[PDB]
Amino acid sequence: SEVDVEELKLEILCKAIKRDEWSATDGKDDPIEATKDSIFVKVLQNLLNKGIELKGYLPKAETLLQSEELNSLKTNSYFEFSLKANYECYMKM
Amino acid sequence: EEAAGFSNTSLILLHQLEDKMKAHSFFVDFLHQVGLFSRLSTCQTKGMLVATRLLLSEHAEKLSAAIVLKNHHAKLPVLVNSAIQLALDKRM
């Protein structure tokens, strides 16, 4: 609580999108989030059969607080289409 | 519930529409239990005559199985034929 845990938790997940590069091909969304995608595939170690509460265990990441940092980087207009879109199949995951 | 505002642009669209055949399935069950064993205004729709409104629940179910079938088959010819259809009905 002194050194800011959840500030860094955002700093990293935001540069995890800057490297992705949100683009568009022929007027359609380009999901660059291939690394953000893969990292959220890597958090789950199938802990459903490990007896861990995996169900409801991604509220580590923030959401409204994230687009605050995206505004600082000037990148909100590019990525906010698939940030929410992928955050829907992350509430089903 | 499984109703929740899931983004339309989500890459995993198919699973989102499976959730809506389940949502329309617990919806038919929460009609069957809570009475409502009446009401039937099908009449005439698009050249089709239909005996009972309850055929429209079955008809919206059959055409929510049709959607998941052509979501299961996604390839460039069909997605081109779709983009032409959608742009003819209205702008996107």
TrEMBL record, chain A:
It is found in: Chromosome, Centromere, Kinetochore; Nucleus, Nuclear pore complex. Transmembrane segments: none annotated. It comes from the Eukaryota. Involved in poly(A)+ RNA transport. Involved in nephrogenesis. Forms part of the Nup160 subcomplex in the nuclear pore which is composed of NUP160, NUP133, NUP107 and Nup96. This complex plays a role in RNA export and in tethering Nup98 and NUP153 to the nucleus. Belongs to the nucleoporin Nup133 family. This is Nuclear pore complex protein Nup133. It comes from Xenopus laevis. The gene is nup133.L.
